[PDB]
């Protein structure tokens, strides 16, 4: 229902990554890490106990009805998605896991370069036109794409795509993809892509005209 | 050590029967709570089922309850999990986890398997349309210009596309697959260069697809 | 529906981004601390907002050069979100948070003449951190000059 | 001042009475089961359309200067509208009763059709007992133009007190005595529920404090033995209320199962990890006590929202069926009962507000849409002005 939830940190940064549940948790949640493409992990167990082969680093606490995870010292190892194991409540299922606390690298703000590339010839004699616009090396990862077409505000058509955060400079890559078919591209002239950007005063529109 | 090897995973039409096999290693699986957890693509992990071979006992998530049915073999050391009337949310990777104690379910799933991959859907095995997005005529003189190749309709997954045949690498963004309406997954690649090689270097997009045994060679020109 | 109509109300707050005029019901964006002061020294800015509360929203900073774009400063989250900085003002530059108050702070160190603009504020309307920046203040002259 | 003062009276009621009935018409279908609420909203909604032509009778002093089937129609349906509305509430009474008291037995009774079935009955029945009603309805010969609308029985002088009986005992006094007896039944029936799942959850403290002091595998055997029978005996015991069986059903069949998992243990002789298995016990009963707290408030929600419902009818209605039998013993009014007389009625017509406006009240979802909806509203206006305004500016 919900997407995880963004945590940027730099490396030996204090973080803090808080589940809360309906009920007074009494020592009732696990933390599991999950970096991408792997299995989970177990961190803590009991919600103050440490785990085998988990550094001190790693420590359950209790706020109320809010359990937090600490990581005193972050190392490079620490960034992936954490899960946390909800306390059992009546009815519910035997285990249910909490939305993940996706934790990344922090790193100064940069706009995206946005590109937009017309469909090609090729494509068009399939009879379906797909309208690629690309967000290139954006920082922090949220951003949003609106697609106008003749200046009319497009829904349920398109799709976004985000790799992950990069391995060299950890900055992110979108590609908003729209889906027409060529009965519907004929009948419209200009094609725009607008991104909304937090590093971005005024949003940065891209456009193409058919032909 | 610990280890849980599995198996069955693959492809099945919807309302199809699948068995998943958990193979264990280390440990009597009598004594112990074999639990299924399944994560969709994108999405958080998820609990499915549980059983414990010592008493019997056997429980079951409301979204799966009475559609599944996990087992164990005591004999052969396995744990089975009998899927029925799949539907398309029930594409996901399967990972079979146990606890340290068999009554500590509740404390965290210590051991955890490889995971396998269950996909369900009703396409066929059908081979890529590549198609060139022409980098900008109108872009930056001195700076960086963008141009990739649209991998779109092609089923199973993965795809694996390179430019120049590993040559070029630096600038080179491949972006997830997409699964669209229609059961097909498409997915671009887009690969930024500097403006001035356009006219002269060549890029061709190497998108090499598997499962369909189809090679092709894209040429992206202005 | 109300989270979209929310996000409706957010367009029609949008339609009053159309509107988009003073601050009569939004945030207030009054700028201060800004004048001549010699490089290397150390200069704060504040603009306390009323008429809306900014502890649901975040609140970011942009400065403009004489003859140059609206670039990117500083963007303050909200509370546990962590706080963002460019890479020119990576460093030097610190902005802080007063929910109570509903006022901002950028506090400067180790300017440089470089840095001699107008620091224009904004506040994100999206409570998704989608850089829906919809109001801005008059800004103040910040002169980075002996 | 005075003469009009009664007229206006009756016109802030009807007012708000027609508003705030549709409100809850728009609400429901855009506490009660949905289906009794509906039709009790009619019984208003009908009830208040006639309301004006009968305000404007007293406004002329005895004119009825409509039509003589006006008469017999509005005056029946006025008439109709206090047999119809407590019928439909003693229905409500006794479709909780049979909800909460024979659930079993009323699985099948408690149908979307079947309802809609029984409601068309009570409507019928309500034109039944309204048959005297239709017989004298006709137009009373008032003296020169005017005409009284009233009922002409045949020997006024003598039937007044059958008639008068007939309606108090049939829409007063029957319909109370029937629902009373129904709320206190349920009332009943829930300390009872209430009292025995606590006395089930009870025998599982007192024996799990056992296992953690039991030094054998006898005893924990004996120990874990009572708890599922106390389990078992718990879970179909879940069965016998109508908010306490889709939600407090569920949580049972992990209670059921760790305690086999523990007596599974317990048999083997592996003391030190049935202990342990049945220590994990005390997570779920402190989940037990919770699920159950939130139901057990959500139960009285619903309780007391049905009895206030019903309540506010039998009391706003009870003093003038106090003066109504009063004035047999007592023919000649006075100029205070006269006051008192027209006092009591308009207690008795506040009856339409309160059921529809109460009913919203009491509940956090309805007022939830109604902000909401309200904001929404003035806000699409605001933006329409807005709309407007921006125009003015620029268009
Ligand atoms: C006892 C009772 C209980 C319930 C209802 N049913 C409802 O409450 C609705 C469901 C909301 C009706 C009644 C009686 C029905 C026969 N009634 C006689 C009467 C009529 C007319 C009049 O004189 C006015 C003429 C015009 C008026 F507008 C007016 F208010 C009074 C005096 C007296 C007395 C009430």
Not at chain 1, 62 to 79: A, H, K, N, V, W
Not at chain 2, 136 to 155: H, N, R, W
Request: charged content about 15%; hydrophobic content about 40%.
């Amino acid at each position: 229902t919900q997407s995880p939830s963004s945590l940027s940190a730099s490396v030996g940064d204090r973080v803090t990554i808080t589940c809360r549940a309906s009920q007074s948790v009494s020592s009732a949640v696990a933390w599991y890490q999950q970096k991408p493409g792997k299995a989970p992990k177990l961190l803590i167990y009991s919600a103050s106990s440490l785990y085998s082969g988990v550094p001190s680093r790693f420590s359950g606490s209790r706020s109320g009805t809010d359990f937090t995870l600490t990581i005193s010292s972050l190392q490079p190892e620490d960034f992936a998605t954490y899960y946390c194991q909800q306390p059992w409540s009546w009815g519910s299922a035997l285990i249910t896991f909490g939305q993940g606390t996706k934790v990344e690298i922090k790193r100064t703000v940069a706009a995206p370069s946005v590109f937009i590339f017309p469909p090609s010839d090729s494509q068009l004699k399939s009879g379906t036109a797909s309208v690629v616009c690309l967000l290139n090396n954006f920082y922090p990862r949220e951003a949003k794409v609106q697609w106008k077409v003749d200046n009319a505000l497009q829904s349920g058509n398109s799709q976004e795509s985000v790799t992950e955060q990069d391995s060299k400079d950890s900055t992110y890559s979108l590609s908003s993809t729209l889906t027409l078919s060529k009965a519907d591209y004929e009948k419209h002239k200009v094609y725009a892509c607008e991104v909304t950007h937090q590093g971005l005063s005024s949003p940065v529109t891209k456009s193409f005209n058919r032909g | 050590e610990v280890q849980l090897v599995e198996s069955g995973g693959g492809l099945v039409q919807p309302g199809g029967s699948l068995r998943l096999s958990c193979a264990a290693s280390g440990f009597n699986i009598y004594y112990s709570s074999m639990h299924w957890v399944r994560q969709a693509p994108g999405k958080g992990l998820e609990w499915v089922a549980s059983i414990s071979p010592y008493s019997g006992s056997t429980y079951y998530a409301d979204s799966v309850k009475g559609r599944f049915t996990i087992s164990a073999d005591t004999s052969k050391n396995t744990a089975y999990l009998q899927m029925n009337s799949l539907r398309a949310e029930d594409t996901a990777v399967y990972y079979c986890a146990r606890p340290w104690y068999p009554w500590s379910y509740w404390s965290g799933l210590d051991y955890w398997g490889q995971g396998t991959l269950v996909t369900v859907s009703s396409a066929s095995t059908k081979g890529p349309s590549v198609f060139p997005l022409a980098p900008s005529s109108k872009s930056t003189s001195g700076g960086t210009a963008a141009l990739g190749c649209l991998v779109k309709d092609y089923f199973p997954e993965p795809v694996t596309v390179s430019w120049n045949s590993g040559a070029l690498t630096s600038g080179v963004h491949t972006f997830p697959a997409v699964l669209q309406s229609s059961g097909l997954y498409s997915l671009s690649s887009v690969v930024t260069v500097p403006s001035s090689s356009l006219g002269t270097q060549t890029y061709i997009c190497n998108v090499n697809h598997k499962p369909s045994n189809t090679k092709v060679d894209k040429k992206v020109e202005p | 529906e109300i989270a979209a109509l929310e996000k409706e109300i957010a367009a029609l707050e949008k339609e009053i981004a159309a509107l988009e005029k003073g601050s009569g019901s939004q945030v207030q964006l009054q700028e201060s601390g800004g004048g001549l002061v010699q490089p290397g020294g150390s200069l704060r800015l504040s603009c306390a907002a009323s008429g809306r509360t900014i502890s649901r929203y975040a609140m970011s900073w942009f400065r403009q050069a004489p003859g140059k774009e609206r670039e990117f400063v500083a963007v303050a989250r909200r509370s546990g979100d962590g706080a963002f900085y460019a890479d020119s003002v990576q460093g030097r530059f610190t902005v802080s948070r007063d929910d109570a108050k509903n006022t901002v702070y950028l506090q400067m160190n180790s300017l440089k003449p470089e840095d001699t603009a107008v620091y224009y504020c904004a506040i994100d309307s999206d409570t998704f951190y989608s850089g829906s920046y919809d109001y801005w203040g008059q800004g103040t002259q910040v002169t980075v000059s002996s | 001042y005075i003469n009009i003062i009664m007229p206006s009276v009756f016109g802030t009621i009807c007012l708000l009475g027609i508003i705030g009935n549709s409100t809850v018409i728009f609400a429901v279908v855009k506490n009660v089961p949905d289906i009794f609420i509906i039709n009790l909203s009619v019984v208003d909604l009908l009830f208040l359309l006639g309301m004006p032509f009968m305000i404007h009778q007293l406004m002329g002093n005895g004119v009825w200067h409509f039509g003589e089937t006006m008469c017999t129609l509005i005056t029946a349906m006025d008439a109709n509208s206090q047999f119809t509305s407590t019928y439909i509430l003693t229905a409500m009474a006794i479709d909780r009763y049979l909800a909460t008291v024979h659930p079993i037995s009323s699985t099948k009774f408690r149908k979307p059709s079947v309802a809609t079935l029984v409601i068309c009955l009570l409507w019928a029945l309500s034109f039944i007992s309204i048959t005297p009603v239709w017989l004298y309805a006709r137009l009373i010969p008032f003296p020169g133009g005017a005409v009284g609308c009233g009922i002409r029985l045949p020997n006024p002088d003598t039937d007044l007190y059958w008639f008068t009986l007939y309606q108090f005992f049939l829409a007063f006094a029957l319909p109370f005595v029937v629902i009373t007896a129904a709320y206190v039944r349920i009332l009943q029936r829930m300390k009872r529920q209430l009292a025995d799942l606590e006395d089930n959850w009870e025998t599982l403290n007192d024996n799990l404090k056992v296992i953690e002091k039991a030094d054998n595998a006898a005893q924990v055997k004996d120990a874990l033995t009572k708890m599922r029978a106390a389990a078992l005996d718990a879970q179909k015991a879940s069965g016998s209320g109508s908010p306490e069986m889709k939600d407090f059903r569920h949580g049972f069949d992990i209670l059921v199962g760790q305690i086999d998992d523990a007596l599974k243990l317990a048999n083997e002789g592996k003391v030190k990890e049935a202990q342990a298995a049945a220590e994990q016990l005390k997570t779920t009963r402190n989940a037990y006590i919770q699920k159950y707290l939130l139901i057990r408030l959500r139960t009285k929600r619903v309780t007391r929202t049905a009895i206030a419902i019903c309540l506010v009818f039998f009391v706003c209605w009870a003093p003038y069926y106090v003066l109504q039998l009063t004035q047999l013993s007592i023919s000649r009014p006075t100029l205070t009962f006269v006051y008192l007389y027209n006092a009591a009625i308009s207690l008795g017509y506040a009856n339409s507000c309160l059921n529809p406006f109460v009913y919203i009240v009491l509940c956090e979802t309805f007022r939830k849409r109604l902000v909401l909806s309200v904001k929404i509203a003035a806000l699409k206006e605001k933006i329409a002005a807005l709309k407007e305004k921006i125009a003015a500016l620029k268009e």
